[PDB]
Amino acid sequence: SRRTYTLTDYLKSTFRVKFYTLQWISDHEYLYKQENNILLFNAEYGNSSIFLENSTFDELGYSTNDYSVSPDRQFILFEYNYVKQWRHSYTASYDIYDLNKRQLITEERIPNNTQWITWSPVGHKLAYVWNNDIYVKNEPNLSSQRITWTGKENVIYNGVTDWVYEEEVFSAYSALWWSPNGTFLAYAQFNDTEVPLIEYSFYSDESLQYPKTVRIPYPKAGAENPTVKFFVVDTRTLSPNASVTSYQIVPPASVLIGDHYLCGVTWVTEERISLQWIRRAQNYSIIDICDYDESTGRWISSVARQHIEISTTGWVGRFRPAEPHFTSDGNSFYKIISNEEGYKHICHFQTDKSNCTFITKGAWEVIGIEALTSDYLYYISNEHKGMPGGRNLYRIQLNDYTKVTCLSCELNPERCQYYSASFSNKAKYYQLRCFGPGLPLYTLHSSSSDKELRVLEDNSALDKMLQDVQMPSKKLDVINLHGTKFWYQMILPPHFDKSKKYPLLIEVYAGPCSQKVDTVFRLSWATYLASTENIIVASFDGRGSGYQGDKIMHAINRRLGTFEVEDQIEATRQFSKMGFVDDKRIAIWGWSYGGYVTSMVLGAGSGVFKCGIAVAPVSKWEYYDSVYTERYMGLPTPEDNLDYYRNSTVMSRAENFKQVEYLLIHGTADDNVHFQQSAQLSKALVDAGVDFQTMWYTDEDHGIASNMAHQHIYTHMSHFLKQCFSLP
Amino acid sequence: SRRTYTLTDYLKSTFRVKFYTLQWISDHEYLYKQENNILLFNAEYGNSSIFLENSTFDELGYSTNDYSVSPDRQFILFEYNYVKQWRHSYTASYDIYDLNKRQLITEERIPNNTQWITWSPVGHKLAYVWNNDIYVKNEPNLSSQRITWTGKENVIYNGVTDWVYEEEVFSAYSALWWSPNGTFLAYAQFNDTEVPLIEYSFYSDESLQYPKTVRIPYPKAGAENPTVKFFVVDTRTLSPNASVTSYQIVPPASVLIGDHYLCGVTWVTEERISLQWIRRAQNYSIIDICDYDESTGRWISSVARQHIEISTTGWVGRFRPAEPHFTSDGNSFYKIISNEEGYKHICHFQTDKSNCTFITKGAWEVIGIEALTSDYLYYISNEHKGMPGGRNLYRIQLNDYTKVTCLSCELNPERCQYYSASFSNKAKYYQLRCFGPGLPLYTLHSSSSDKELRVLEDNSALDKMLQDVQMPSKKLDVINLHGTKFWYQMILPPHFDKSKKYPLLIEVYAGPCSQKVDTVFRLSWATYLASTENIIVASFDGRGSGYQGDKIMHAINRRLGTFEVEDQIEATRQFSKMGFVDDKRIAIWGWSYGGYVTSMVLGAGSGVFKCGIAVAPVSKWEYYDSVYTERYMGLPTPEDNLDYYRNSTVMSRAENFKQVEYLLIHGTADDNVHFQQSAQLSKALVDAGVDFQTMWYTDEDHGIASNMAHQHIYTHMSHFLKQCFSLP
Ligand SMILES: *[C@@H]1O[C@H](CO)[C@@H](O[C@@H]2O[C@H](CO)[C@@H](O[C@@H]3O[C@H](CO)[C@@H](O)[C@H](O)[C@@H]3O)[C@H](O)[C@H]2NC(C)=O)[C@H](O)[C@H]1NC(C)=O
Ligand SMILES: *[C@@H]1O[C@H](CO)[C@@H](O[C@@H]2O[C@H](CO)[C@@H](O)[C@H](O)[C@H]2NC(C)=O)[C@H](O)[C@H]1NC(C)=O
Ligand SMILES: *[C@@H]1O[C@H](CO)[C@@H](O[C@@H]2O[C@H](CO)[C@@H](O)[C@H](O)[C@H]2NC(C)=O)[C@H](O)[C@H]1NC(C)=O
Ligand SMILES: *[C@@H]1O[C@H](CO)[C@@H](O[C@@H]2O[C@H](CO)[C@@H](O)[C@H](O)[C@H]2NC(C)=O)[C@H](O)[C@H]1NC(C)=O
Ligand SMILES: *[C@@H]1O[C@H](CO)[C@@H](O[C@@H]2O[C@H](CO)[C@@H](O)[C@H](O)[C@H]2NC(C)=O)[C@H](O)[C@H]1NC(C)=O
Ligand SMILES: *C(N)[C@@H]1CCCN1C(=O)[C@@H](N)Cc1ccc(I)cc1
Ligand SMILES: *C(N)[C@@H]1CCCN1C(=O)[C@@H](N)Cc1ccc(I)cc1
Ligand SMILES: *[C@@H]1O[C@H](CO)[C@@H](O)[C@H](O)[C@H]1NC(C)=O
Ligand SMILES: *[C@@H]1O[C@H](CO)[C@@H](O)[C@H](O)[C@H]1NC(C)=O
Ligand SMILES: *[C@@H]1O[C@H](CO)[C@@H](O)[C@H](O)[C@H]1NC(C)=O
Ligand SMILES: *[C@@H]1O[C@H](CO)[C@@H](O)[C@H](O)[C@H]1NC(C)=O
Ligand SMILES: *[C@@H]1O[C@H](CO)[C@@H](O)[C@H](O)[C@H]1NC(C)=O
Ligand SMILES: *[C@@H]1O[C@H](CO)[C@@H](O)[C@H](O)[C@H]1NC(C)=O
Ligand SMILES: *[C@@H]1O[C@H](CO)[C@@H](O)[C@H](O)[C@H]1NC(C)=O
User: Which helix (H) or strand (E) holds B44?
Assistant: First the structure.
């Protein structure tokens, strides 16, 4: 009877998955925009009430908003006219609306193309970056004070990151931080003067007669990296006829020595800030906790307050060293690190002592610290049921590491095994976000009573919608490789036959510290491949993956393209041992690093895979950026690791592609994995006499994210997989 | 029984078609390279002597790619270190060899990276371009003397064409012209200052960490074109401590009025030069025969000596206006222009009388004037058998235009219907080149008795091989469209069997004045397609084609992408309704203009074609260069032809692509038809939700001619074709 999940279902998001985004604005109240009106919900009394109606969002372009209400609740910031740039970065326009007089501020408006804006932590101060320079507004109707005058396109960024810092270090565009009471505003300046430029054509609209050339300061492996400086402005003296009072905090000697990176900024107190630096190698990190000298206005550093974290078996942290979470008095902090066993656990440090005390242990890892009060610490880990692909919220008593309780494990054990949490201030309440394995579920809770104050979103609407369709099922199991058990998952077609034979599709990412296998509910292209095309879609996290301890994650240090690729084969090999797999029809695919591994596996000449598809794949690590590549492969010089760079390019394996049907896809405007990568790859194959297929996407970036492109690629990839599989 | 001409035979040229390349150097002697020796033959006598032993090459420390002997037979130029640029342009290194003392002149050498070099018509002077400047060397062993100082990269070219003059007007990279006795040295200077730059990426070898951005001053439709200046230099006063004596010849005012092009330079005598200019709108052209004034050094022009040529139905010439052929004395010249009946024939002009007299007439055309003596004039036309796709050599008596003799018609009426010739210095002898339909045949003839002195090359070898292989047959014929007789050709598969239904592939170019239907013998991809895959390959010349009169050719003036594509469809539709054609399997493919035409047809929704391949297609004329585009479309403004520009793009037909299988190939380093053109086309298709196949070629250009690429694209297109035709 009932239907199957169709490609059109997937491409037209006909089966919507709802979520519940809120914005805490006190230890017990939060804002939520419904339809278009911001409502203020009180978590302590359960009552709510419109904060400002739908009738104030005057569309000044096309669509609108995202909002930000000043901590003092006297003003509200409205963003619209959003112009996307890189992954996190973009420009937009802002309008400040007075919540008192209840009028839109027209005098001293915020510039068109602001790159970043933000309220001070308290009161209603503003600090924004426009044309790479920092400006501050003590009042929404006053004139801003220019803080920096060095701003310069493609060269000097003040308050916002350059391309590589946005992407591989901060995972954000923002590079300014207000101090708790708004006394100080800290920021970072990036200098790209010596950073080479990546360049590519961007054809624009059909009517543009000459293509334009995009130029971006992008450091590829080995290249000259951008430098950085850090400053702390004392906003108290900001006046139109006064000078900007500031101080430059320089990194510690152990780091100044050579090329380094600024990777973390944490305000401990108004008089204390914490900076986290890392040498360019990324196996030596350090935390420098600076104190404000009242009598001189300078932030003094101290050996007693510095904390070195290093890695002798790989790199520090997962994707970057863990951030420290300071206590209120700032005299001590907690930060995740690797223990003697190689597992990521919480360690307790005292601001001025170098030895710490782990407050957790186990054959599991703390995913990240979430909230900290004077009595408890709330964190996320994959301990529960020993599944590295699960996430639960836990609370541990600071005065007895014995009293640890799981606050989410048994709320809905079958439907919910993957949470993320969002606490209020002082952490007296929290939103629980459940992403699977069952339909997503958002609920609010009290921290004291641990009770479920209410259901914010249950997706019951999607539940109905789905009971009428033949959904596939997702199973997570285990196989052993090298005496170790690695997890895998398979999306199984509806009424999963049994011993009958189905074509297999490995969906791989496998980048370092990644995790493709999990209990997150997803409605993806695989869902359709299984439900409608009856294709099994497996995934496997072998060596290099994360969340299972450094032993597994650092297996690929300095040798990407080896184990993670090899394990994808060994596992698919076993998958074919199983009787429901049609070994004559096994394919593989992946995007980005998944594109790389897809290609490397297809280039292995293992005889196991029939066809593959790589999308925006890395092909030669020397083409990728410094921060990411150098973290796992070191420098591409003969005195360092140039050898493993050389033998891990996809081109080196071109002759074997003759044994498989290959589909290579890239977006011509990929600022991330430059189209260049695929250009050098197809050339090698051409030189090698290998037939394959191609698909370029004019002006699409790393995401091939436009609607038309999105639908095109999957439709195009679908026909390919079906052809290779002899499917109608 | 016998094998078939296989795809591999075509790609690796297993079957070589020999030819014979000689260089005349007198009226009875020509140079010929044999087994790497330069031999000097003697016409009539037939004997030959070693002019330079191949042992001379081996002593040189490099691969001598080309040679040139001084007209006085004392020196020989050795071209090596060749480095191709555009279609004609390229730089090289040169060594001058002293034939008398048999040494390699090693002092005051020619610089490396020479853009162009050439001997004076007599003696052994040299003129060369280097760094966009002109240098003159009187003696091989003496310092050269600089002539221009303005030469600047991508902006000022002295003695060599810029991108657009090379490709569109001169079909050459040289812009130098020695006078008959080498007294003067005429040269054009090109200013690209205000011409926009086309920018694209060149990836180069894998080791290149960052791609290189290529930039060419390239004028696209309606854009600022480069400007030009002509100059005659009196080399006699050339001395290190002396300025340069030069006069700038400006075009007649009727042309100077606005944007113009210099499209011809012909020396008549040592004191008379003929320049040919054209207006940006190529429907007005004028010849200005200038005389040297000994008392001033000026080159004076006179209204009497000016001949205006214009078209009311299209543009002047076939691609450019025919060039004037002057008489020894210089008082009269012969040039091809259009009849009052629209047919291109030879008109006799008086150097100072505005009227001329047509010495030839009919419903056929003269392709070109080959030689001119004081009694006879030799030309090539397609009159024989009223076959527009044929070529023969004719001789006409200047004293009586009634006696015309066809020198090639009856030499091999069955094997040779397409010739081209080469005459000795005074036309005392001529080499006839027979390119089809039989195997190419080169022969030597004496202008006196017109008897065949000997067979230079008959390809007897090739003839022996092919008899042992099932070669397909090529039949030319006619059909009627719009009440006219348009020619076509079909490469029929071996042992053709009317009654049985073959798949049909239409190979099309269709560019204005083009000719796909001819009698030239060609070992092509179609040969393989028909001999092996049993697919019929046909070509059709409809409206817009050339060599059939202006009424046919100018039909698409100002409306490119209409009648000619419309004529391809009507024609196929007829072939479709024939018996031996399986209308359920008809494809069409093409390159450049052909690619554009293939696309416009596929997107016409005429339902005739199943699939199509487009290689480096034009997609929107505003993207192509001005000289060529503006010649058939005029200017892309609302006051001109902007409207036919607008509805002639391929994008505007993107939707109809939902009805056909389409392959889109394009070199990413195509400087001629920019990649942008396909980039824009795919984007349109993707935005129209249409699925198609793509294939980019890293760094290949318009010809996609590297040996590896060349093979890949034909193997690729072969697969695609076989799929679509349901062929195993
Ligand atoms: C430099 O030039 C000399 C010519 O003086 C080249 O010698 C030629 O070498 C070829 C190959 O060994 C000879 O070809 C032979 O021709 C006979 C016909 O008489 C044929 O039966 C054989 O099958 C073979 O093809 C050729 O006779 C000989 N010189 C002549 C008479 O043309 C020499 O090869 C050249 N050196 C190089 C490497 O360029
Ligand atoms: C690059 O070369 C290294 C060195 O040979 C390869 O490492 C070896 O791989 C083989 C086959 O998988 C193993 O049996 C050896 O034990 C490895 N030796 C060492 C020293 O590690 C590596 O696999 C190659 N990597 C790529 C990208 O092909
Ligand atoms: C090439 O053409 C440019 C104009 O496109 C010439 O530049 C002009 O030079 C004159 C005198 O040097 C100035 O008065 C003008 O202002 C310039 N025009 C512009 C807009 O640049 C240039 O001189 C030409 N080059 C040569 C050597 O002929
Ligand atoms: C020579 O070509 C020009 C350039 O196209 C002709 O003039 C244009 O004619 C079209 C219509 O045919 C008009 O739409 C344009 O506005 C005209 N532009 C100009 C500058 O006149 C011109 O008529 C042709 N000369 C002749 C009469 O043969
Ligand atoms: C561009 O638009 C013009 C105007 O409609 C088209 O010209 C006419 O096309 C129809 C269809 O062939 C004919 O019946 C008319 O005789 C054409 N002539 C004119 C002047 O109207 C033209 O075909 C379109 N070109 C393209 C490439 O689509
Ligand atoms: C594709 N996955 C591509 C090539 C490997 C690295 N790639 C990225 O896009 C990364 N920048 C992803 C990423 C982002 C942020 C962090 I911290 C870590 C990885
Ligand atoms: C493809 N054939 C492309 C688009 C039409 C013009 N094209 C060219 O490549 C031409 N530049 C070829 C050409 C060159 C010189 C003359 I005179 C005429 C045509
Ligand atoms: C909720 O109701 C209480 C009264 O018990 C009131 O003090 C408060 O203002 C209300 N808060 C909201 C969010 O409406
Ligand atoms: C504004 O909110 C109301 C609900 O109170 C809703 O009915 C209306 O459609 C919304 N208009 C929009 C889309 O801004
Ligand atoms: C940026 O760095 C360059 C050195 O590469 C230096 O000359 C310049 O002063 C720096 N700019 C700033 C504002 O720090
Ligand atoms: C700041 O200086 C400007 C002119 O330099 C002056 O108009 C203004 O009054 C000064 N600010 C104050 C309030 O002193
Ligand atoms: C950190 O990495 C560098 C660069 O690869 C290496 O030379 C250095 O010895 C490492 N330090 C360690 C492992 O402590
Ligand atoms: C042909 O050329 C040779 C020199 O290679 C010469 O000896 C001979 O006399 C010439 N033949 C005649 C008789 O003209
Ligand atoms: C000019 O010629 C004279 C000959 O008298 C020579 O001595 C002088 O060096 C020359 N000057 C140059 C190098 O232009």
Answer: none
Q: Are A547 and A367 in contact (CB under 8 A)?
A: yes
Residue B200 near residue B675, CB atoms below 8 Å: yes
Across B55-183, where does the E strand assignment appear?
Answer: 64-69, 75-84, 90-98, 103-105, 116-119, 126-130, 133-137, 145-146, 156-158, 176-178
Last residue before each gap in chain A (C to N over 2.5 A): none
Asked whether A4 and A468 are in contact (CB, 8 A), the reply is no
CA A443 to chain CA centroid, nearest Å: 23
DSSP lists the bridge partners of residue B366 as: B381
- What dihedral angle (degrees, nearest 10) is formed by the CA atoms of B510, B514, B516, B521? -160
- Residue A592 annotated as catalytic: yes
CA of B241 to the centre of ligand 14 (A): 6
Dmax over CA atoms of chain A, in Å, equals 81
Residues of B in contact with A719 (CB under 8 A): 691
Domains of chain B (ranges, CATH numbers): 1-470 (2.140.10.30), 471-728 (3.40.50.1820)
Ligand 11 centroid to residue A241 C-alpha, Å:
6
Resolution in A: 2.8
- Residue keyed to tokens 């701003």: A151
B692's enclosing H/E stretch is none
DSSP-derived 3-state class of residue A269: strand
**Residues 6+ positions from B146 with CB-CB distance below 8 Å:** B133, B134, B135
> Which burial class, exposed, middle or buried, applies to B106 when counting CB atoms under 10 A from its CB (0-12, 13-18, 19+)?
exposed
Dist. CA A460–CA A102, nearest whole Å: 38
A293, two tokens: 């000298």
Nearby residues of A437 by Cβ (< 8 Å), 6 or more positions away: A414, A415, A416, A417, A418, A474, A519, A520, A521
* R_g over Cα of chain A: 26
Best CA proximity match to A346, nearest among A366, A374, A324:
A366
- State how far Cα A624 lies from the chain centre: 18
> Contact, B680 vs B651, CB < 8 A?
yes
Minimal CA–CA distance to B70: which of B133, B175, B140?
Answer: B140
Cβ count near A459 (within 10 Å) = 21
A683, A696, A709: residue with CB nearest B694: A696
Token pair 């730059």 is found at B197
Q: What are the start-end ranges of the H helices in A604-659?
A: 626-633, 642-646
> Would residue A288 show up in a list of annotated catalytic residues for this protein?
no
Residue whose pair of structure tokens reads 């297996």 in the numeric block = A555
Q: Report how far residue A115's alpha carbon sits from residue A109's, in angstroms, rounded to the nearest whole number.
A: 15
**Cβ of residue A258 lying under 6 Å from some atom of ligand 11:** no
* C-alpha to C-alpha distances, B393 to A59, A338, B343, B556, nearest whole angstrom: 76, 89, 18, 30
Euclidean distance between CA atoms A387 and A397, whole angstroms = 24
Q: Which two tokens stand for residue B525?
A: 């991809």
Q: Considering every ligand atom, which ligand is closest to the CA of A621?
A: 6
Q: Is the CB of A241 under 6 A from ligand 11?
A: yes
The count of C-alpha atoms lying within 13 angstroms of the C-alpha of B399, restricted to the half-sphere facing its C-beta, is: 3
Name the active-site residue from B70, B285, B447, B592: B592
**Alpha-carbon distance values, B641 to B196, B260, B376, B635 (Å):** 22, 19, 45, 6
B133 tagged catalytic: no
Task: Answer yes or no: do B684 and A206 touch at CB < 8 A.
Answer: yes
Contact A206 B651 (CB under 8 A): yes
Closest ligand to residue A32's CA: 8
Tell me how the structure was determined. Answer: X-ray
Q: Whole-angstrom Cα distance, residue A343 to residue B399? A: 104
Tally Cβ neighbours within 10 Å of residue B22: 18
Which has the closest alpha carbon to B460: B16, B144, B55? B16
